[PDB]
Short mmCIF file of C-alpha atoms in Angstrom, two decimals:
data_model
loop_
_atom_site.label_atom_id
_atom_site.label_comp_id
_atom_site.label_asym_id
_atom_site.label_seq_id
_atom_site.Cartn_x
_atom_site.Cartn_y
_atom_site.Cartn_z
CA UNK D 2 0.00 0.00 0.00
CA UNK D 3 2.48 2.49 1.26
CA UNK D 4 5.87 3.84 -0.16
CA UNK D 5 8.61 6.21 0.96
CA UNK D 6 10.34 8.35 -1.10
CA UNK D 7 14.38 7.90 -2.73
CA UNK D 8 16.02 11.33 -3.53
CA UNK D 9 18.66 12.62 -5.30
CA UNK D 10 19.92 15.84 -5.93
CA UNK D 11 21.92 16.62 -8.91
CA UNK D 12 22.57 19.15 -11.91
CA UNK D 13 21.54 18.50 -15.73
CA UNK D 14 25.21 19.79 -16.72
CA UNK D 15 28.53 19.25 -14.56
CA UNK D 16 28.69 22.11 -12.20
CA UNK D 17 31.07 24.88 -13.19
CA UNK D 18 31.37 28.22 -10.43
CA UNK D 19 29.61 30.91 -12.16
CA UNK D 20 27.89 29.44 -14.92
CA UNK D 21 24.33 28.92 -15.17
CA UNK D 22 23.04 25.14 -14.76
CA UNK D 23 19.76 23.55 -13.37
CA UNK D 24 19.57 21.72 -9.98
CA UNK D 25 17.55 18.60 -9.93
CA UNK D 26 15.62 16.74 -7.59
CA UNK D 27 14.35 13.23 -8.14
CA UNK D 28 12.18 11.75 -5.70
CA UNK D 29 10.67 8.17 -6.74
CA UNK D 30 9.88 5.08 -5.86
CA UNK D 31 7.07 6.15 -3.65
CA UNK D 32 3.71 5.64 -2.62
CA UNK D 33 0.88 7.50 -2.84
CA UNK D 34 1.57 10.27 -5.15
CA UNK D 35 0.55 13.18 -2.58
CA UNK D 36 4.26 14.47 -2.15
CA UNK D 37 6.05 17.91 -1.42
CA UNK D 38 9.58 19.42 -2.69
CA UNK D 39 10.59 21.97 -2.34
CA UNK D 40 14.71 23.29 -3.90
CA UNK D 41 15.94 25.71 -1.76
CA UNK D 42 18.97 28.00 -2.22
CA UNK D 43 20.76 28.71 1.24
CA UNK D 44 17.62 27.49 3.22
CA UNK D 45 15.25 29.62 1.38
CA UNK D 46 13.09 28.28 -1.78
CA UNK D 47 13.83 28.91 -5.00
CA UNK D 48 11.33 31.17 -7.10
CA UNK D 49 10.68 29.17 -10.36
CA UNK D 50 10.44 26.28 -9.44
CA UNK D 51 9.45 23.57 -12.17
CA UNK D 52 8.15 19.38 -11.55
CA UNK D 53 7.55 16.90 -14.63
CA UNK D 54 4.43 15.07 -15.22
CA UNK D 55 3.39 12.45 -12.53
CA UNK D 56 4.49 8.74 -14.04
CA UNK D 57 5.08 5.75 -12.41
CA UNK D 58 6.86 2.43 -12.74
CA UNK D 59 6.02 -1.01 -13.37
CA UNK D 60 6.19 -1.30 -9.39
CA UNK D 61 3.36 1.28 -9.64
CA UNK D 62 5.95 3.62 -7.47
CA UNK D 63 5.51 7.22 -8.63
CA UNK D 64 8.56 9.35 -9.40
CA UNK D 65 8.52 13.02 -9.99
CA UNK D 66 11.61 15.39 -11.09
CA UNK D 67 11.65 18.87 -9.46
CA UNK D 68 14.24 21.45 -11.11
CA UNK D 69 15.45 25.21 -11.46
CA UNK D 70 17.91 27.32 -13.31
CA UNK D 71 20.69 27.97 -10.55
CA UNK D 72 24.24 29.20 -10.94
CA UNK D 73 26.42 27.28 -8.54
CA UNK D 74 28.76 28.85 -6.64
CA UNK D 75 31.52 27.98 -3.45
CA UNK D 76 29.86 29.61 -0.82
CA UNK D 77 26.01 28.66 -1.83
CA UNK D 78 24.33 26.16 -0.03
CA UNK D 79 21.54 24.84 -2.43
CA UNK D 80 19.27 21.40 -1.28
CA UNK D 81 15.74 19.41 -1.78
CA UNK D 82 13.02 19.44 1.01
CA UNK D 83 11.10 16.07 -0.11
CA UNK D 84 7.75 16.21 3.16
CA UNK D 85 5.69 13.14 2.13
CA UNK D 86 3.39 10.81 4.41
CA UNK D 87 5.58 8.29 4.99
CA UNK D 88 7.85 10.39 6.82
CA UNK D 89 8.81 11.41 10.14
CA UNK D 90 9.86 14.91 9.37
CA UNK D 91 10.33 15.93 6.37
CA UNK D 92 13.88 14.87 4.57
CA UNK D 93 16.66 17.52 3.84
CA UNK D 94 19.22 16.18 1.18
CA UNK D 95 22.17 18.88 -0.18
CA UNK D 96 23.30 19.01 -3.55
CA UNK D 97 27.18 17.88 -3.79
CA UNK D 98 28.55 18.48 -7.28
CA UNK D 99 30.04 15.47 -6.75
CA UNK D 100 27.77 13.78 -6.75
CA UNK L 1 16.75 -2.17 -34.01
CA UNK L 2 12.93 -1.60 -34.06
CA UNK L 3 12.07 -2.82 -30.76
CA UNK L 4 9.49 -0.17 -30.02
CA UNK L 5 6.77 0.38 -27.45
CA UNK L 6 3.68 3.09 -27.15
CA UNK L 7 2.80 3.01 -23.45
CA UNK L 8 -0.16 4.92 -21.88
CA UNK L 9 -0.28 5.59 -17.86
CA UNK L 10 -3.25 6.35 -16.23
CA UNK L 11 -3.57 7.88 -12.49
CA UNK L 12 -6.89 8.84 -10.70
CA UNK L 13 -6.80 10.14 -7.65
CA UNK L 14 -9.68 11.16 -4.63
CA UNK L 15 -9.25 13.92 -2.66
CA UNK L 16 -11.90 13.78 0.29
CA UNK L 17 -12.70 17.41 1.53
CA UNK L 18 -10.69 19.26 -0.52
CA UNK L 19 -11.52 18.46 -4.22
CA UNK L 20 -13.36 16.22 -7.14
CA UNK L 21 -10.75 13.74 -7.89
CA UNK L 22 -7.73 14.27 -10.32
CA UNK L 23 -6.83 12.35 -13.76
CA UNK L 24 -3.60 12.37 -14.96
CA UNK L 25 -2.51 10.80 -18.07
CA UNK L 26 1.39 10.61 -19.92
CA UNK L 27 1.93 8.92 -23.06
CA UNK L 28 5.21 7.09 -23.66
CA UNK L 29 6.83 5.35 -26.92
CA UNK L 30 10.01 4.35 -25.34
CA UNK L 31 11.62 6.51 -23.05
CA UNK L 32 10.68 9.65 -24.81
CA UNK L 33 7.12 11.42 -22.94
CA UNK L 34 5.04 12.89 -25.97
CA UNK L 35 1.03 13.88 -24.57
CA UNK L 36 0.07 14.72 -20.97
CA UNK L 37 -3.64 15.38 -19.76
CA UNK L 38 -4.74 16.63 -16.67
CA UNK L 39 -8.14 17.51 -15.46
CA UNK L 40 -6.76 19.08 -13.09
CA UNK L 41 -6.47 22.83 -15.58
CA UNK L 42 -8.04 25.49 -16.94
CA UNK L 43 -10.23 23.76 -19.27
CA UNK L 44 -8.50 20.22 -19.61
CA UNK L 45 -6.78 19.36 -23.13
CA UNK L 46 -4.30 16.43 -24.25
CA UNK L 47 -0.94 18.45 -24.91
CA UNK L 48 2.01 17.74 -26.78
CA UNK L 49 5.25 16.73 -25.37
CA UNK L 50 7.05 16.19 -28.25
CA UNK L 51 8.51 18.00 -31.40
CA UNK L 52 6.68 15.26 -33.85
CA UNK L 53 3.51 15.44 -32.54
CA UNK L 54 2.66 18.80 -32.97
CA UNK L 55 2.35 18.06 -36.53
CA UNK L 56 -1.01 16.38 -35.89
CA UNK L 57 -3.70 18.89 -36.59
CA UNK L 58 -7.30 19.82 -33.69
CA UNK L 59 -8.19 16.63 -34.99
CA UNK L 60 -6.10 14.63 -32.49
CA UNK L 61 -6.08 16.45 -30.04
CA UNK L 62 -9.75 16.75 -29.97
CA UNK L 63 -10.11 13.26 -29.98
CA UNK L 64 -7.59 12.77 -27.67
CA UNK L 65 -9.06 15.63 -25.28
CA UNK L 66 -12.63 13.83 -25.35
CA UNK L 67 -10.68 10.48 -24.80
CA UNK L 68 -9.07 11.44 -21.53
CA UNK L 69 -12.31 13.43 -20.54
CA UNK L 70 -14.47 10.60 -20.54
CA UNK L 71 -11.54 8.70 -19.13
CA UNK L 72 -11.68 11.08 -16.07
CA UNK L 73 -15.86 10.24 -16.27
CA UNK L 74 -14.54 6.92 -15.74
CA UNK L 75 -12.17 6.98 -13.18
CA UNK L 76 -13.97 9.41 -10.92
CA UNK L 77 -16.58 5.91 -11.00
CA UNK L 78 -13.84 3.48 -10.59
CA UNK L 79 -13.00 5.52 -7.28
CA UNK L 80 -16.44 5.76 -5.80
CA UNK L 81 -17.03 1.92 -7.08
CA UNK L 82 -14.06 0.65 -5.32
CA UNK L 83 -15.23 2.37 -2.13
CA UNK L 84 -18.35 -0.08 -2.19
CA UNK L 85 -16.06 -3.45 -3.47
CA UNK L 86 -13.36 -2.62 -0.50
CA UNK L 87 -15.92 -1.41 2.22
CA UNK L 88 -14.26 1.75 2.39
CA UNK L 89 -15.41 5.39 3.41
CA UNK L 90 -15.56 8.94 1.53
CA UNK L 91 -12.85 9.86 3.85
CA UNK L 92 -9.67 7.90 2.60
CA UNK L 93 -7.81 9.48 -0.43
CA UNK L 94 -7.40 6.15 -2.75
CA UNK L 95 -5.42 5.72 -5.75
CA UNK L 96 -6.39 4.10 -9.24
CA UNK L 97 -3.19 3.02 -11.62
CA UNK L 98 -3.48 2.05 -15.67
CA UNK L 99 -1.02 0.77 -17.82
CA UNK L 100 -1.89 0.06 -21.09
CA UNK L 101 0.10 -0.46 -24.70
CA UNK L 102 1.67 -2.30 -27.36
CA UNK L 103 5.28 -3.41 -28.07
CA UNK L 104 6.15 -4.08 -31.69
CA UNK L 105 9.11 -6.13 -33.45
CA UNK L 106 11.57 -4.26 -35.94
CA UNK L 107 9.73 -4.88 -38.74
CA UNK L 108 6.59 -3.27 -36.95
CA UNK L 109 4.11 -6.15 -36.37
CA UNK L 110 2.10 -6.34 -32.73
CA UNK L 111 4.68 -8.32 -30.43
CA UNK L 112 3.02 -7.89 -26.57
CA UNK L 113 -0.24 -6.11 -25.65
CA UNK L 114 -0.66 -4.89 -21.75
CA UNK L 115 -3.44 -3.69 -19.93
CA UNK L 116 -3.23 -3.66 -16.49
CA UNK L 117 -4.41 -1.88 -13.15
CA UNK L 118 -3.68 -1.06 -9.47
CA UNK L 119 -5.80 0.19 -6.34
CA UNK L 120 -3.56 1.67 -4.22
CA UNK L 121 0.03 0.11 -5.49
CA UNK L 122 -1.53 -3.20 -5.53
CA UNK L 123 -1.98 -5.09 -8.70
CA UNK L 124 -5.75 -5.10 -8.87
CA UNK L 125 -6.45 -6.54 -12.62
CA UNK L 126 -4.11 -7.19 -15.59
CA UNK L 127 -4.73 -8.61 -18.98
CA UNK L 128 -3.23 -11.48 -19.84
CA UNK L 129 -0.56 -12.23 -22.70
CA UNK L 130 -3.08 -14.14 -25.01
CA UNK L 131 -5.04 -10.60 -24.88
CA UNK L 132 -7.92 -12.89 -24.22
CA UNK L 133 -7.89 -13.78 -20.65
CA UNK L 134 -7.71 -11.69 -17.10
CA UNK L 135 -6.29 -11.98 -13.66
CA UNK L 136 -7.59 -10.78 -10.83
CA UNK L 137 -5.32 -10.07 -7.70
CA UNK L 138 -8.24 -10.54 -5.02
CA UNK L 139 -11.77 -12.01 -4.45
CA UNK L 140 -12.69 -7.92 -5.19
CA UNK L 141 -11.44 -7.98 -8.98
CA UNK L 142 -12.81 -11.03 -9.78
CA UNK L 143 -16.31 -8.83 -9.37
CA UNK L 144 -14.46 -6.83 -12.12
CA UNK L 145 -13.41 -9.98 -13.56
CA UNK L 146 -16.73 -11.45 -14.44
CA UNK L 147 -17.83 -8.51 -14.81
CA UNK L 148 -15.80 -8.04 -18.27
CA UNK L 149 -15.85 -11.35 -18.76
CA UNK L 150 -19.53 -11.10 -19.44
CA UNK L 151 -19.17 -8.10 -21.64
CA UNK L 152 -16.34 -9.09 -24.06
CA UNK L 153 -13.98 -6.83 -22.83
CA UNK L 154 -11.07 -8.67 -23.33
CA UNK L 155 -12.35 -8.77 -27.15
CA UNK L 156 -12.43 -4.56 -27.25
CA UNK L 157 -8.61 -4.16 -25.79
CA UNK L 158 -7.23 -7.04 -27.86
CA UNK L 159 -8.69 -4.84 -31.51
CA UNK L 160 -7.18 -1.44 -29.89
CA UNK L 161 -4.02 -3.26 -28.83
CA UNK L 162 -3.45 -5.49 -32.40
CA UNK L 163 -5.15 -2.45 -34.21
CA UNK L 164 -4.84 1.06 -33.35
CA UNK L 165 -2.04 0.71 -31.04
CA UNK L 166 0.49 -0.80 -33.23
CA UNK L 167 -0.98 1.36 -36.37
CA UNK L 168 -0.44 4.82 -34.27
CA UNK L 169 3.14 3.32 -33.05
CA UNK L 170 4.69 3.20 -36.68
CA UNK L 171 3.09 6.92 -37.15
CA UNK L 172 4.81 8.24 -34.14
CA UNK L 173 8.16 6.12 -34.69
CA UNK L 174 8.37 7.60 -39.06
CA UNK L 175 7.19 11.12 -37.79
CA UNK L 176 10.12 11.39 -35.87
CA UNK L 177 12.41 8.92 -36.82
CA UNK L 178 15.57 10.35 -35.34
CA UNK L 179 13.82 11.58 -31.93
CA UNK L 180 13.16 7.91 -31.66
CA UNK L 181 15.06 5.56 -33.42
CA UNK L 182 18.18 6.55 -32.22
CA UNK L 183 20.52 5.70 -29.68
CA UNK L 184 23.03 8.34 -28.64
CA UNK L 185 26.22 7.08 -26.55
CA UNK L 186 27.00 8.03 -23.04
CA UNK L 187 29.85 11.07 -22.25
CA UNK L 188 31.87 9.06 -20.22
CA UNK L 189 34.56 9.96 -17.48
CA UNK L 190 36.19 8.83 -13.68
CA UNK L 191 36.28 11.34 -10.94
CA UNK L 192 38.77 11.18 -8.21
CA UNK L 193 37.46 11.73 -4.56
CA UNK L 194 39.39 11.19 -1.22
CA UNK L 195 37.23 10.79 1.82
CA UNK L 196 40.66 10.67 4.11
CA UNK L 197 44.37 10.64 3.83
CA UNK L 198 44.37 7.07 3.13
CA UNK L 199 41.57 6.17 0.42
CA UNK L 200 39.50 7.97 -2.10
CA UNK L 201 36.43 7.71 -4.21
CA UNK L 202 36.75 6.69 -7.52
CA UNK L 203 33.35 7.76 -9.40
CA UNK L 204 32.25 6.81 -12.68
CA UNK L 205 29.69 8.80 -15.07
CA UNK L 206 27.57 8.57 -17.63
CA UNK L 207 25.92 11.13 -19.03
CA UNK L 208 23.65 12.32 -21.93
CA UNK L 209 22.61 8.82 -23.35
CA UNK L 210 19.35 7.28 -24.75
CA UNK L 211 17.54 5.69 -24.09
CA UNK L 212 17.84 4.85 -20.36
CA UNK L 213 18.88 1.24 -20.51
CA UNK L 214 22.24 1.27 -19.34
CA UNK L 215 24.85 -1.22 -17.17
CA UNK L 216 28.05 0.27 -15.34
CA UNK L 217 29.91 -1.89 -13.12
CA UNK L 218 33.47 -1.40 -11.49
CA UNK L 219 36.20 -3.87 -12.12
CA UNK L 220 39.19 -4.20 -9.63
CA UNK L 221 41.88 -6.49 -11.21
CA UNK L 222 39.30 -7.61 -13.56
CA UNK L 223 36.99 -8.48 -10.85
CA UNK L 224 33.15 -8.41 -10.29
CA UNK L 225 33.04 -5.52 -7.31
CA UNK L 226 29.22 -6.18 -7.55
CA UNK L 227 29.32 -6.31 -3.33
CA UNK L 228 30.84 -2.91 -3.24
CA UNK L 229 29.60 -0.55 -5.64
CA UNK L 230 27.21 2.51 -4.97
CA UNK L 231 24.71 2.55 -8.05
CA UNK L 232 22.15 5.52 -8.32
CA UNK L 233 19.14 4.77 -10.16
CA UNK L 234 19.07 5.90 -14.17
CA UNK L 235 17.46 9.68 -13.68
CA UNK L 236 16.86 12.35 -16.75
CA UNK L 237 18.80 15.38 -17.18
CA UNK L 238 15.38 16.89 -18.09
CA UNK L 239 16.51 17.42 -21.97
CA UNK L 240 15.31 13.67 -23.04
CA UNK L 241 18.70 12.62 -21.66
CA UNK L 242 19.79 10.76 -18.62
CA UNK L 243 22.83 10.02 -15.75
CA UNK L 244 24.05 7.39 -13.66
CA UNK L 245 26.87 7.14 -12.15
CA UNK L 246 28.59 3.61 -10.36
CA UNK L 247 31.28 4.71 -7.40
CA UNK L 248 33.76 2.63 -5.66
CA UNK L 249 35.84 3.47 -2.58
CA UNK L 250 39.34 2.14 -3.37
CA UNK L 251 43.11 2.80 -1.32
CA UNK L 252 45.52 5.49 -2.49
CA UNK L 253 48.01 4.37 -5.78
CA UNK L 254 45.51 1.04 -6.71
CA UNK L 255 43.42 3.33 -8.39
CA UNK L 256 44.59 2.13 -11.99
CA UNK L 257 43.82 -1.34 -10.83
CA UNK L 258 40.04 -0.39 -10.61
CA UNK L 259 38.35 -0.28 -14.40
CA UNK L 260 34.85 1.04 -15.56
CA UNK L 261 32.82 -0.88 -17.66
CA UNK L 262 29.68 0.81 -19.93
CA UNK L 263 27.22 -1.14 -22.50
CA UNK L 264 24.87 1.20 -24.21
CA UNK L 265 22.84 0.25 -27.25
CA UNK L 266 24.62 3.38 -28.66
CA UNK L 267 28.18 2.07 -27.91
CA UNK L 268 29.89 -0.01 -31.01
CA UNK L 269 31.59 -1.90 -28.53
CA UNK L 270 31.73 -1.71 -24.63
CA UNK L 271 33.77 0.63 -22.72
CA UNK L 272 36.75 0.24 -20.20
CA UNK L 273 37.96 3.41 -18.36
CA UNK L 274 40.27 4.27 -15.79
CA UNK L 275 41.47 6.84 -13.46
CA UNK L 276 43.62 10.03 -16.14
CA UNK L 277 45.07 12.10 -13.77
CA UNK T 1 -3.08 7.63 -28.96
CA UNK T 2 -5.23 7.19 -26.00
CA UNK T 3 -7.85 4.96 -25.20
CA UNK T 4 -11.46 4.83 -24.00
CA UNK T 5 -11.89 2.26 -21.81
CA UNK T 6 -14.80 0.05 -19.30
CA UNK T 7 -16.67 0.42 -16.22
CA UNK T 8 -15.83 -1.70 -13.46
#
C-alpha cells in the first residue's frame, strides 16, 4: 500500500562556479503520489520552481523530477526538502557536485 | 533495431474534503514522454510533449481531449465503485493506476499487448498475454473480472491493442524517426574523490545517453566488485537525456587497478575506463 | 493515442 520516497539531488550539466546550470531533484519510488519538494537555495526556496508530469513504474511507485535554473557557486548552499506521508519529518538532502 | 513500445499511464486520484478527484494521463513510446492530460487545468486538453507530434492537426487532439475526458468520467466511477467493493469510506484518499500499450518487433508487427491496473500500489487486474484472458489479484477484482468477462472486454482491448495501437506506433516512430530511433552514446569519465588521507572515491559517469537502458559496473583487477559498488538509479537530465553514475571506494596508488565498464545500445563496442590524472 | 476504456 504504502511507499517512501528515494532522492537525489543533482545538476543537468557538470557544475562549473559561475555558470548557469539547473539543480535537480528526483524523488521516486514512492507511494501514494501526494508528495512535497521543495529546492531551496541557502535554506530559502527557490522562485521558479518547475516538476515533470506524474508517471510511475512497473512497481506502480511514482517518481517526480523537481528542477530550477541555478548558478552554482563555493559559498552557496543549495538542497531538496522532499515532506511526504511516509515520513517522520520531512527529509533535507544537499546538492554535492560530486555527486 | 525496431524494438518499439507506445505506453499509456493512467492515475486517478480522490481527494476527500478538498476536491473532485484528479486524472492524470502521460503517453510514452520508449523513453521519450510525448502527450500529458490533466483535469486538473483550466479547461483540460491532451498536450504535446514532443517535437513530432505537434504536426497532428485539432483533430487529435480533440479526440484525444474527449478520450481522456471521458476517461476522467470513468475513473472518478472506478473511485467511488471501489469504495463499495473494498468497504471503504468517503474519507480515505485512494489511488487508481493504468497501464496500457503495445510493443512491436523491428519490422513493426504487434509483439506484446498490456493492460493492467492497481488500487492503491496493488496489482488489482491485468490482462493477460493471449489478450484474451484476465487476472484478478483478489476475491474484489474477480467482481471486475466477471464482470468483463460477461461483456467481451477482453475482445475490445485485444482490436485497440493489435489495431490502433500498433498502427499509431509506426506513425509516431516515421514522424520522428531520429527523436526515436536513435541511440546516442553516453559522455563518459572517472572522478577522483578522497574521503581521508588514506583512500579515495573513484566515481564513474555517464551522461547524456538514450535511451535509459544502461549497465556500469566497477572492475578491480578484472573483478566483479558487484558487493561494493554505490549505483544511483538511471534519472533524466530533463533534456530527453539521462545520468548514472557507479562509485567505488578504493586505497591510495591502486586506483589504476580499478576499471569502468559501460554497454549502451549506442556504444559499437563496450567501454573500459580508468582513473587520467 | 489514447484509449477509451470500461466500467468496473
Amino acid at each position: 500500500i504504502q511507499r517512501t520516497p528515494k532522492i537525489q539531488v543533482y545538476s543537468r550539466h557538470p557544475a562549473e562556479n559561475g555558470k548557469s546550470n539547473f539543480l535537480n531533484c528526483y524523488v521516486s519510488g514512492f507511494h501514494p503520489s501526494d508528495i512535497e519538494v521543495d529546492l531551496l537555495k541557502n535554506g530559502e526556496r527557490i522562485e521558479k520552481v518547475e516538476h515533470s508530469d506524474l508517471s510511475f513504474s512497473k512497481d506502480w511507485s511514482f517518481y517526480l523530477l523537481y528542477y530550477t535554473e541555478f548558478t552554482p557557486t563555493e559559498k552557496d548552499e543549495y538542497a531538496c526538502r522532499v515532506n511526504h506521508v511516509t515520513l517522520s519529518q520531512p527529509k533535507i538532502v544537499k546538492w554535492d557536485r560530486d555527486m | 533495431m525496431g524494438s518499439h513500445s507506445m505506453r499509456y499511464f493512467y492515475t486517478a486520484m480522490s481527494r476527500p474534503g478538498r476536491g473532485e478527484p484528479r486524472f492524470i494521463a502521460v503517453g510514452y513510446v520508449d523513453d521519450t514522454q510525448f502527450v500529458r492530460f490533466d483535469s486538473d487545468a483550466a479547461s483540460p486538453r491532451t498536450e504535446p510533449r514532443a517535437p513530432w507530434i505537434e504536426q497532428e492537426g485539432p483533430e487529435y487532439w480533440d479526440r484525444e481531449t474527449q478520450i481522456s475526458k471521458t476517461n476522467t468520467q470513468t475513473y472518478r466511477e472506478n473511485l467511488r465503485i471501489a469504495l463499495r467493493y473494498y468497504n471503504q469510506s468517503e474519507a480515505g484518499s485512494h489511488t487508481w493506476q493504468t497501464m496500457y500499450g503495445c510493443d512491436v518487433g523491428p519490422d513493426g508487427r504487434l509483439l506484446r499487448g498490456h493492460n493492467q491496473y492497481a488500487y492503491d500500489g496493488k496489482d488489482y487486474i491485468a490482462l493477460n498475454e493471449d489478450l484474451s484472458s484476465w487476472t484478478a489479484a483478489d476475491t474484489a477484482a474477480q467482481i471486475t473480472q466477471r464482470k468483463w468477462e460477461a461483456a467481451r472486454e477482453a475482445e475490445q482491448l485485444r482490436a485497440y491493442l493489435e489495431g490502433l495501437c500498433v498502427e499509431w506506433l509506426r506513425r509516431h516512430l516515421e514522424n520522428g524517426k531520429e527523436t526515436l530511433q536513435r541511440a546516442d552514446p553516453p559522455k563518459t569519465h572517472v572522478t577522483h574523490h578522497p574521503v581521508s588521507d588514506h583512500e579515495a572515491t573513484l566515481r564513474c559517469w555517464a551522461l547524456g545517453f538514450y535511451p535509459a537502458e544502461i549497465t556500469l559496473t566497477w572492475q578491480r583487477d578484472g573483478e566483479d566488485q558487484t558487493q561494493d559498488t554505490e549505483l544511483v538509479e538511471t534519472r533524466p537530465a530533463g533534456d530527453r537525456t539521462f545520468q548514472k553514475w557507479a562509485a567505488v571506494v578504493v586505497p591510495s596508488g591502486e586506483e589504476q587497478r580499478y576499471t569502468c565498464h559501460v554497454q549502451h545500445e549506442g556504444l559499437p563496442k563496450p567501454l573500459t575506463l580508468r582513473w587520467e590524472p | 493515442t489514447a484509449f477509451t476504456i470500461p466500467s468496473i
